[PDB]
């Protein structure tokens, strides 16, 4: 399309800026004659002309307009302005605009109003204003609900749909008189009967604060709720299907929501300004949750909790997701990104601050620690590629909804959180939260870029007379504007340190230039024989300091508790001292640093910076490790080995090794739990237990295989009296299905179809993918695609579980190659992303044959395009090339190591 | 290359014709300095010039010449002829010629001699003069041995290497004095010491009869033998490695060989003319056996037999292969094909006549009957394709060694045998063998084409005043010169019959024209309610006769005992009467016709001539069938269903159905064998038992799974006291490995590596491919390629066993696509063929995705070419296209049928 025309460009003009809107929406929750569920609406937007223009460009997606006064819209003056007549309108589909061509130009610094009347489908597509469905007995319940993030508000009413186009919104919902209407604000006065039809109520809501379009929510349902006024006076309600509320499954959410909201208000010295915060769980929802201001939406598995059937991991998911959503009330809603390229200002903050909130609510769980695994190490895998991207991408590169959706990724979330964790560490949280309070106060009801944050943190540093090697901006720009992270290499003979950009493939091509030269300013903490030393700042590529020199028996480790976003290598002598320490008394090294030593060495090995046997040697001590984290870090790093080797001669010896390493831990838990009758008191110990069972069974410990098959058989014999503790269900179900046959599978499928608890359905859905029978996986694949059997929101998640199974690899890859066009249409756009699927189906690739298929897949589908999976495909090509070389270099030494160390 | 030059054309000129040869060969059975095993030789060929020519074109492959008198060869006169001087010689590699360019022309009807001195590698390539190796303790034994068929005599000495170039051969072998030299004939006088080195003996053999080059054999070994003069005065010796002979493992061969030789000499009224017939078993051999005149070579599994460890199936293999080889002494050696396009004159005859000989030796086994399964139904699968070929291909189409090798296929062997079985049936064997005696007498020491056979059968018909609807030639040309076979469709309402060319795909393109219009002259036998009717000849496309009309309860079946090479369809009413008969008393229908009803209906269903449920309904009675053959025919037809469905939702219900159908038979055998302590007396009942066990275990009968895993465990606990009867070992080993894990696999691999019995090694080698673990199949694939672990002769056989496993499908197909060039070099030419591998890896293909891979595989390797697998690839493309359509048309009805009938 002609790029010279503004209506063919993806960013809105700067010529017009909205002030406020009124919107009336009326969903029809029964099908029409055509069998369509529809909504009808109207809107008036009041806006200011900032520069003279003869066109109104406004977003509109899948809306049909009712003609009024001869055109798609009516344009009126405000405060005496006299707008031109409308010539014609057009709908421009690629850029998603309604374009109003005028017979003259609007006047600079004048206001106007535009009125529209429209209709859209209330589709089951989880996007915009859409329908969710559930059964209560044999009665079909239909719910009208919304998901605007990022660019779907325009699919519900015409609007200037970019996050810096903030406005007040005056919402009216027209709905069946028996159903409750909900929105961001509370109702304004009473609901009144619709004049034309008293079977409907008209419910107007109070005006919203100035806010972004992507945060609006409109819901019509017959949900029930529980409620409690929080200690800061805000009303909290937890809303869900009536049976869930009556069963008490909203009670845990009610226990934690208000207290976390009040905690954040205190911690950041910034009140929550709205009269209420509703939490609502939807049967059909395409994310964990969404932070709509005043009406936070959740999938059921992230909000509801059944103390008798949900696991401790499920409970942890509920409190952390609630905390993340509530964090956004400050970081996202009150203060909002200027544009999506800086998404981490919303998502990095919510991902970090969620742990502070969850830790407040559950102080005995020690959750803050899990950031090392869930954030730092999660994102370092992709951030070690040449095809990663900076935390803050240049704004001019992010234009289309696909490019926007793509940024909701491990960089924006987990690297955002890691960099904030690092910053808080070197500033102290007291100084950090002081700068944040200032940031929030200054930019309340406005939009920010990354520089605005640094300015306010600088203000706090300057007030506290904190001395840093340079300004906050210059330290943090290194971590924000260029991709990747450094490996810091220590020579303990001389006390020298040096840094370089860590790349998993040495022979990979960094094409994105950095004005920072891939050199960082790095805060370095360290310990010497377990005692913390003075902090150090590495400002250059290399330095020397006696802090890093050792003699005699001494060892040093850098990055205490992995507060910093960097990996560490040492000379081989220091590594040997570390390995000696792990054999002598592993408890002398902080638990997070035991995870670090394992995870760093495996990644260093991939990068050819240490021999692979060094990384494998670092797992030897695990035979007597009882802590969750070091085991989890090892299993996560060895996941790569499984992906590379589970179709090869190396796999037997690998499984033999893991069997040996985990057996004493499995036996410890068997004894300590009084033969699986009890679960450990401590949360991390509960997680350690689950990992010991999972690892024991996956790798062939016979006592584990007997245990899980026995428990599952006992359940089959007593379907309504499940004997398996909730914590153990995922792993018992998966391993019992893997060990069993068609009869176990069919039992679990019927339990899934009949499930009344979402946490229970989820565990079964994953377990069913554990079948070793190809014909069963093929049949299951066909079910994942049938929305009457597996909810559309769960289709790609289940397909990923199938491809993770070694027997499902060929099946799913061939399926994806053969069906890309149709798949892309159904689960690749709108509220959906195919990024996770591309990543999962390709991560085993380690052969030229598979690389050629992947290259051909790219070529064959270049025209369809890959939308929000574009970068995942580039990353898959890079990783596959690295994998071919790594397998060639490592397969013999790894086979020999596992063989020689598993006996 | 320039096609105008005779040395660039594949067929020899007709200008020169050999009379006799002397050849001296000296193998060196220890490596030289270069590490090469070599042979050195000399030859003189005496030949007649038939038309004046200035070039001698003679075959030569991988031979290096020692210059003599200034050139590669010396040309001398005979009987006063005066040959021109040699200008120069060249070796032309594609056509495999030594080309001797002369300074003038040879004279028509004059004789000449050409002398050569040469050297070749005694390679481990199983072709020409090659080396075989075995260990006796820690001593490496090296054997020089030969395989000339079809076009490798030229790889041992220069010769006019085409089968109609018959000559006498005077062989001398120079060999270590301690080793025995063997050839076609007996030694001529004593062995004498080599003058230059008395550590070697020189052994000259008597002149051969006039014979073809592909039948020559030269062997040097320290084998031992057992011997017996046969009743026709011919000396028989069975030669093998000393340990096998001492163990008595040559004894069964000695029991059967002479008696079968004498039987054939009597039956065909034609003496075997040579003084001896040696049978020799080689450790390295690329076929079942080879019929060299006077020195028949065998792989060990086809000649040796251990009564304490070989199965009844193994014993049947030995007698039938010996019988096949001995049949060739008449059909192939005494009388020889003019050219390879008429190969069935050798191979069709040996494949049919083998049963007559084996039945003579083992009259209680009823083997002749197995022709229906092993010949008729084996070949009808490929002969129903548009890409099949006639029994007698036009001679001008068969030129290269690849094209020749390709003809050693189910058409030349099994269709050849089926057509001869049909001919014998309509003539009577008395009249058949009378015409054959005449054929053999007339063409002894000469070469024939298919017309020569008809002429001699006609002579017998005319002598006996047999009346046929036309001449033997005109009846049999229909079965010989066009591909395929008819389906005869009966309308029992009206007594009408009609025929059409049977094509598995209706939408497949027959491109090879037939001067016979794909119309046959068909001898039709029939039964009515079990009573045989008068015979009928269908000479036209349609006819009417009251023989084929029924009324009331009567049924008719055509093709009693399937003597004729045709399929039969009926109107649905007659089919229903047949199905009623099978429910009432299945024994009222001859056993071979129970197999026919099943096999025909399944093939008819594929061809869209009956509904698939009709073919499935024909298997219902199997629940009370105890006979081997109908079960085997059903399992063979349902193999297709397994290939189409074992990666689909249909597979569960299919296995459930087979489980139901086989359980009573399995329980019958469990009881009748006194819990597997005994085996049945009757051979077919022994085979029925094995099939019941195999089918029960494959489809999940729990008593079977427990039985096999129990027996295998008992063996592991007592390795030197195997508790599994030899008949049961293949199926017990495979199913125990499938049910087990790494420990069962490793035990069987060590048993394989340590095997001293070839029959035992073979069963283990197949069983190891039954692992359900992808990593284990991948590791095993790597072993198949290592000649130190699996003998080169067994590499592709083992790869085929892996691809037959559903879990091995993707593995092997991806391997074949990725490694075609190297694979083609190693196992695709010379004595090797890749035809079986192409057929096996592609037979599951039923998707557009797989078709596209196959088409791309063809394109990608068009330049490498596909040699003797060319037609198998064309057939795979045709079948894959048919399979995609068949699965689409049948998957729902088949799923429903198996589901509704398995309960
Ligand atoms: C959404 O609802 C809000 C709140 O009711 C509306 O804001 C109100 O708008 C009216 C009319 O513009 C304001 O009164 C006027 O103020 C202007 C100054 O701009 C003055 O010149 C006029 O004489 C008149 O008094 C009123 O103050 C304002 N209320 C608040 C609390 O801001 C808003 O107009 C609605 N937007 C739409 C598109 O319906
Ligand atoms: C292979 O060995 C055979 C058998 O020893 C050789 O056949 C013999 O060849 C000689 C010499 O040609 C024959 O004698 C001659 O016969 C011709 C008639 O063609 C006559 O004109 C001469 O006066 C002379 O007597 C001899 O009959 C023949 N023996 C037999 C049994 O056929 C043959 O030559 C050898 N071939 C080679 C290439 O060494
Ligand atoms: C627990 C949280 C991860 C839940 C919630 N998640 C999200 O907002 C993302 O998953 C987004 N739903 C991802 C996305 C954006 C645009 C188009 C398609 C998909 C959030 O608050 O960030
Ligand atoms: C029991 C018999 C099948 C044994 C024996 N078989 C054969 O001769 C064939 O298998 C041939 N060995 C096939 C062949 C021919 C040319 C090049 C490569 C392979 C035979 O006598 O026909
Ligand atoms: C919008 O109009 C299109 C084109 O006529 C029609 O197909 C579609 O159903 C309409 N949408 C609704 C919700 O009525
Ligand atoms: C919520 O808190 C109440 C009161 O402390 C407690 O009894 C209940 O167990 C809590 N619910 C959950 C799910 O922890
Ligand atoms: C810094 O101190 C000034 C002067 O007291 C105060 O007004 C401001 O709020 C402080 N800023 C921060 C970020 O603490
Ligand atoms: C791993 O440990 C083994 C055994 O102690 C040792 O021989 C080897 O050197 C270690 N690997 C490295 C890279 O240090
Ligand atoms: C034949 O000559 C070629 C070319 O010199 C040589 O490489 C090969 O080894 C020779 N073959 C034998 C058996 O000596
Ligand atoms: C060969 O025949 C002898 C004598 O009849 C018999 O004892 C022996 O069992 C036979 N060998 C085999 C393997 O059948
Ligand atoms: C046919 O009969 C003639 C005359 O007796 C006889 O010479 C010839 O051998 C016979 N041919 C056949 C094929 O039986
Ligand atoms: C197969 O048998 C079923 C059940 O008797 C019958 O309903 C069906 O018609 C049969 N199929 C055919 C093709 O006759
Ligand atoms: Zn978020
Ligand atoms: Zn043969």
Nearest to A130 by CA among A142, A139, A118, A117: A142
Q: Domain boundaries in chain A? A: 1-223, 224-484, 485-570, 571-903
Say whether A861 counts as a known binding-site residue: no
> Tokens for A672?
């300590």
**CB contacts, 8 Å: B647 with chain A:** 774-775, 778, 811
Cα A625 from Cα A635, distance rounded (Å): 13
Scored b (16 or more CB within 10 A) or e, B622-649 reads beebbbbbbbbbbbbbbebbbbbbbbbb
A717 backbone φψ class: left, alpha, beta (φ>0; ψ -120 to 50): alpha
For the four alpha carbons of A632, A635, A639 and A641, in that order, the dihedral sign comes to positive
- Is the Cβ–Cβ distance between B742 and A649 less than 8 Å? no
CB within 8 Å: A646 and B774: yes
Helix (H) or strand (E) holding B48: strand B38-49
Angle between helices B835-842 and B870-901 (to 10 degrees): 30
CB within 8 Å: B649 and A774: no
| DSSP per position, A671-720 | HHTTTTTS--SSHHHHHHHHHHHHHHHHTT-HHHHHHHHHHHHHHHHSTT
CA nearest to B740 within chain A: A739
Asked whether this chain's domains B1-223 and B485-570 adopt the same fold, the reply is yes
* C-alpha distances in Å from residue B677, one per residue of A221, A538, B192, B518: 72, 80, 57, 53
Separation in Å, CA of B651 to nearest CA in chain A: 6
Cross-strand pairs, A289? A298
Q: Which ligand 5 atom minimizes the distance to the CA of A121? A: 13
Tell me the Cα Rg of chain B.
Answer: 28
What CATH code would you report for B571-903?
Answer: 1.25.50.20
- Is the Cβ–Cβ distance between A287 and A299 less than 8 Å? yes
DSSP-derived pairing of the beta strands B38-49 and B111-121: antiparallel
Which position among A204, A316, A325, A689 bears the catalytic label? A325
For residue A189, the ligand closest to its alpha carbon is: 1
Helix (H) or strand (E) holding A821: helix A820-827
Interrupted after residues, chain A (C–N over 2.5 Å): none
Q: Indicate if ligand 10 lies below 6 Å from the C-beta of B249.
A: no
> Tokens for B260?
């079968």
CB within 8 Å: A646 and B775: yes
> Tokens for A813?
């890859």
Residue B820's contacts (CB-CB under 8 Å, 6 or more residues apart) are B857, B860, B861, B864
| DSSP per position, B552-588 | TT--EEESGGG-SS-EEEE-HHHHHHHHHHHHHHGGG
- Enumerate the H helices of B428-471 as residue ranges: 429-443, 450-463
| DSSP per position, B345-359 | HHHHHHHHHHHHHHH
Whether the bond between B67 and the residue before it is cis, its omega within 30 degrees of 0, is no
For the four alpha carbons of B64, B66, B72 and B77, in that order, the dihedral sign comes to negative
* Interface with chain A: mutation pick from B642, B645, B646, B652, highest number of A CBs within 10 Å: B652
Separation in Å, CA of A835 to nearest CA in chain B: 23
Separation in Å, CA of B675 to nearest CA in chain A: 27
What's the half-sphere exposure (Cβ side, CA atoms, 13 Å) at B763?
A: 24
Cα B700 from Cα B606, distance rounded (Å): 27
CB within 8 Å: A774 and B849: no
Nearest to B89 by CA among B62, B64, B56, B41: B56
Nearest to B503 by CA among B391, B595, B680, B381: B381
Three-class DSSP category at B92:
strand
> Tokens for A571?
């000379």
Ligand 5 centroid – CA B331 distance (Å): 80
First-to-final CA distance of chain B: 67
Cα B70 from Cα B52, distance rounded (Å): 24
Q: Indicate if ligand 7 lies below 6 Å from the C-beta of A463.
A: yes
Cα B562 from Cα B594, distance rounded (Å): 10
CB within 8 Å: A652 and B778: no
Cα A98 from Cα A92, distance rounded (Å): 6
| DSSP per position, A425-458 | HHH-HHHHHHHHHHHHHHHTTEEE-HHHHHHHHH
- Nearest by CB to B774, from A776, A807, A814: name it: A807
Task: Classify residue B72 by burial, with Cβ atoms within 10 Å: 0-12, 13-18, 19+.
Answer: buried
Give nearest CA residue, ligand 7 atom 3: A463
Which of A38, A64, A72, A120 maximizes ligand 5 atoms within 8 Å of its Cβ, making it the mutation to test the pocket?
A64
| DSSP per position, B481-533 | SS---EEEEEETTTTEEEEEE--S-TT----S--TTTT---EEE-EEETTEE-
Scored b (16 or more CB within 10 A) or e, A258-270 reads bbbbbbbbebbeb
CB within 8 Å: A775 and B700: no
Separation in Å, CA of A742 to nearest CA in chain B: 8
CB within 8 Å: B742 and A818: no
Separation in Å, CA of A707 to nearest CA in chain B: 18
CA nearest to A645 within chain B: B775
Distance of CA B381 to the CA centre of its chain: 15
Q: What's the full length of chain B, in residues?
A: 903
Nearest to B402 by CA among B102, B10, B116: B10
- Nearest by CB to B782, from A649, A741, A779: name it: A649
Nearest to B448 by CA among B348, B357, B353: B348
Whether the bond between A150 and the residue before it is cis, its omega within 30 degrees of 0, is yes
Scored b (16 or more CB within 10 A) or e, A64-95 reads ebeeeeebbbbbeeeeeeebeebeebebeeeb
| DSSP per position, A270-330 | ----SSEEEEEEESS-SSSEE--TTEEEEEGGGT---TTTS-HHHHHHHHHHHHHHHHHHH
Q: Which are the catalytic amino acids of B?
A: 325
- Nearest by CB to B774, from A647, A779, A817: name it: A647
Q: Indicate if ligand 11 lies below 6 Å from the C-beta of B463.
A: yes
**CB contacts, 8 Å: A807 with chain B:** 774, 807
- CA angle (B395 as vertex; B393, B398 as ends), nearest 5: 80
**CB contacts, 8 Å: B782 with chain A:** 649
Distance of CA A636 to the CA centre of its chain: 18
Q: Which approach determined this entry? A: X-ray
Cα A685 from Cα B317, distance rounded (Å): 64
Q: What's the full length of chain A, in residues?
A: 903
Q: Indicate if ligand 10 lies below 6 Å from the C-beta of B255.
A: yes
The correct CATH number of A224-484 out of 2.60.120.650, 3.40.50.10420, 3.30.70.600, 1.10.390.10 is 1.10.390.10
**Number of Cβ atoms within 10 Å of the Cβ of B141:** 17
First-to-final CA distance of chain A: 67
Nearest to A165 by CA among A259, A48, A62, A70: A48
Q: Which residues surround ligand 14, an ion (CB under 5 A)?
A: B 347, 350
Nearest to A470 by CA among A407, A519, A437: A519
For residue B348, the ligand closest to its alpha carbon is: 14
- Enumerate the H helices of B250-307 as residue ranges: 251-267
- Is the Cβ–Cβ distance between B595 and B372 less than 8 Å? yes
Nearest to A381 by CA among A883, A807, A885, A879: A879
Cα A119 from Cα A44, distance rounded (Å): 15
Domain A485-570 has CATH 3.40.50.720: no
Binding-site residue ranges of B for Zn(2+):
324, 328, 347
Q: Indicate if ligand 7 lies below 6 Å from the C-beta of A459.
A: yes
- CA angle (A305 as vertex; A304, A306 as ends), nearest 5: 130
Separation in Å, CA of A846 to nearest CA in chain B: 13
- Is the Cβ–Cβ distance between A737 and A801 less than 8 Å? no
Q: Which ligand 6 atom minimizes the distance to the CA of A315? A: 13
Cα B200 from Cα B221, distance rounded (Å): 13
Q: Which ligand 6 atom minimizes the distance to the CA of A254? A: 1
- Nearest by CB to B652, from A775, A782, A818: name it: A775
Q: Indicate if ligand 2 lies below 6 Å from the C-beta of B22.
A: yes
* Interface with chain B: mutation pick from A768, A774, A822, highest number of B CBs within 10 Å: A774
CB within 8 Å: A807 and B807: yes
- Is the Cβ–Cβ distance between A257 and A322 less than 8 Å? yes
Q: Indicate if ligand 2 lies below 6 Å from the C-beta of B170.
A: yes
For residue A292, the ligand closest to its alpha carbon is: 3
Distance of CA B438 to the CA centre of its chain: 28
Cα B634 from Cα B630, distance rounded (Å): 6
Residue B70's contacts (CB-CB under 8 Å, 6 or more residues apart) are B86
Ligand 5 centroid – CA B633 distance (Å): 59
- The CATH architecture one would assign to domain A1-223 is Sandwich (2.60)
Tell me the Cα Rg of chain A.
Answer: 28
Ligand 9 centroid – CA B64 distance (Å): 7
3-state secondary structure A161-174: CCCCCCEEEEEEEE
Give nearest CA residue, ligand 1 atom 22: A79
**CB contacts, 8 Å: B803 with chain A:** none
- Is the Cβ–Cβ distance between A134 and A145 less than 8 Å? no
CB within 8 Å: A775 and B651: yes
- Enumerate the H helices of A490-590 as residue ranges: 572-585
- Nearest by CB to A648, from B700, B775, B848: name it: B775
Helix (H) or strand (E) holding A787: none
């Amino acid at each position: 399309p002609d790029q010279s025309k503004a209506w063919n460009r993806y960013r809105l003009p700067n010529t017009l800026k909205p002030d406020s809107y009124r919107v009336t929406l009326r969903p029809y929750l029964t099908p029409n004659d055509r069998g369509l569920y529809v909504f009808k609406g109207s809107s008036t937007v009041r806006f200011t002309c900032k520069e003279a223009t003869d066109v109104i460009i406004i977003h509109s997606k899948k809306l049909n307009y009712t003609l009024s006064q001869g055109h798609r819209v009516v344009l009126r003056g405000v405060g005496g302005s006299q707008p031109p007549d409308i010539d014609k309108t057009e709908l421009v589909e690629p850029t998603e605009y309604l374009v109003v061509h005028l017979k003259g130009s609007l006047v600079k610094d004048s206001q106007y109003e535009m009125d529209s009347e429209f209709e859209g489908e209330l589709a089951d597509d989880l996007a915009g204003f859409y329908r969710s469905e559930y059964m209560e007995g044999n009665v079909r319940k239909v719910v009208a609900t919304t998901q605007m993030q990022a660019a779907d508000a325009r699919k519900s009413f015409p609007c200037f749909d970019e996050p810096a186009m903030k406005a007040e919104f005056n919402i009216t919902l027209i709905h069946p008189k028996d159903l409750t209407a909900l929105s961001n604000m509370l109702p304004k006065g009473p609901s009144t009967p619709l004049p034309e039809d008293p079977n409907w109520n008209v419910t107007e809501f109070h005006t919203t604060p100035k806010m972004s379009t992507y945060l609006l929510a409109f819901i019509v349902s017959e949900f029930d709720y529980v409620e409690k006024q929080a200690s800061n006076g805000v009303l909290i309600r937890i809303w869900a299907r009536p049976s869930a509320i009556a069963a008490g499954h909203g009670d845990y959410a009610l226990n934690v929501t208000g207290p976390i909201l009040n905690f954040f208000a205190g911690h950041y010295d910034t009140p929550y300004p709205l009269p209420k915060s509703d939490q609502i769980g939807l049967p059909d929802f395409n994310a964990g949750a969404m932070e709509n201001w005043g009406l936070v939406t959740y999938r059921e598995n992230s909000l509801l909790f059944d103390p008798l059937s949900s696991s401790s991991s499920n409970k942890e998911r509920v409190v952390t997701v609630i905390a993340h959503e509530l964090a956004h009330q400050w970081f996202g809603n009150l203060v909002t990104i200027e544009w999506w390229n800086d998404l981490w200002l919303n998502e990095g903050f919510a991902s970090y601050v969620e742990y502070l909130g969850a830790d407040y609510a559950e102080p005995t769980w020690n959750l803050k620690d899990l950031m090392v695994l869930n954030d730092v190490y999660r994102v370092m895998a992709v951030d070690a590629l040449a095809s990663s991207h900076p935390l803050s991408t240049p704004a001019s590169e992010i234009n289309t909804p696909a490019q926007i959706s793509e940024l909701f990724d491990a960089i924006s979330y987990s690297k955002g959180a890691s960099v904030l964790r690092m910053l808080s560490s070197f500033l102290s949280e007291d100084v950090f939260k002081q700068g944040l309070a200032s940031y929030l106060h200054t930019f309340a009801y406005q939009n920010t870029i990354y520089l605005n944050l640094w300015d306010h943190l600088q203000e706090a540093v300057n007030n506290r007379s904190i001395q840093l090697p340079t300004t906050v901006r210059d330290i943090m720009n290194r971590w924000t504007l260029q991709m990747g992270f450094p490996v810091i290499t220590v020579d303990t003979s001389t006390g020298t340190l040096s840094q370089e950009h860590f790349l998993l493939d040495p022979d990979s091509n960094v094409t994105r230039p950095s004005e920072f030269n891939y050199v960082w300013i790095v805060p370095i903490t360290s310990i010497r024989d377990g005692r913390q030393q003075q902090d150090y700042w590495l400002i250059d590529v290399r330095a020397q300091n006696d802090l890093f020199s050792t003699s005699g028996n001494e060892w040093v480790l850098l990055n205490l508790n992995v507060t910093g976003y960097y990996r560490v290598n040492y000379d081989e002598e220091n590594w040997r001292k570390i390995q000696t320490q792990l054999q002598r008394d592993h408890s002398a090294i902080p638990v997070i640093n035991r995870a670090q030593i394992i995870n760093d060495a495996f990644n260093l090995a991939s990068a050819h910076k240490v021999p692979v046997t060094l990384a494998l040697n670092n797992t030897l001590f695990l035979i007597e490790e009882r802590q969750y984290m070091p085991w989890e870090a090892a299993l996560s790093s060895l996941s790569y080995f499984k992906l590379m080797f589970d179709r090869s001669e190396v796999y037997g010896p690998m499984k033999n090794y893991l069997k040996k390493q985990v057996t004493p831990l499995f036996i410890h838990f068997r004894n300590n739990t009084n033969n699986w009758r009890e679960i450990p008191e401590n949360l991390m110990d509960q997680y350690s237990e689950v990992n010991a069972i999972s690892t024991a069974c996956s790798n062939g410990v016979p006592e584990c295989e007997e245990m899980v098959s026995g428990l599952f058989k006992q359940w089959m014999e007593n379907p309504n009296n499940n004997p398996i503790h909730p914590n153990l269900r995922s792993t018992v179900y998966c391993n019992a299905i893997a060990q069993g046959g068609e009869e176990e599978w069919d039992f679990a499928w019927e339990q899934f179809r009949n499930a009344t608890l979402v946490n229970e359905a989820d565990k079964l859905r994953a377990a069913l993918a554990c079948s070793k029978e190809l014909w069963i996986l093929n049949r299951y694949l066909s079910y994942t695609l049938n929305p009457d059997l597996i909810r559309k929101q769960d289709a790609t998640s289940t397909i990923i579980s199938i491809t993770n199974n070694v027997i499902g690899q060929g099946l799913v890859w061939d399926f994806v190659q053969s069906n890309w066009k149709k798949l892309f249409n159904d689960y690749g756009g709108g509220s959906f992303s195919f990024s996770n699927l591309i990543q999962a189906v390709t991560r085993r690739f380690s052969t030229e044959y598979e690389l050629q298929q992947l290259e051909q897949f790219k070529k064959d589908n270049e025209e369809t395009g890959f939308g929000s999976g574009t970068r995942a495909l580039e990353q898959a090509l890079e990783k596959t090339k690295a994998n071919i070389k790594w397998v060639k270099e490592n397969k013999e030494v790894v086979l020999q190591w596992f063989t020689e160390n598993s006996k």
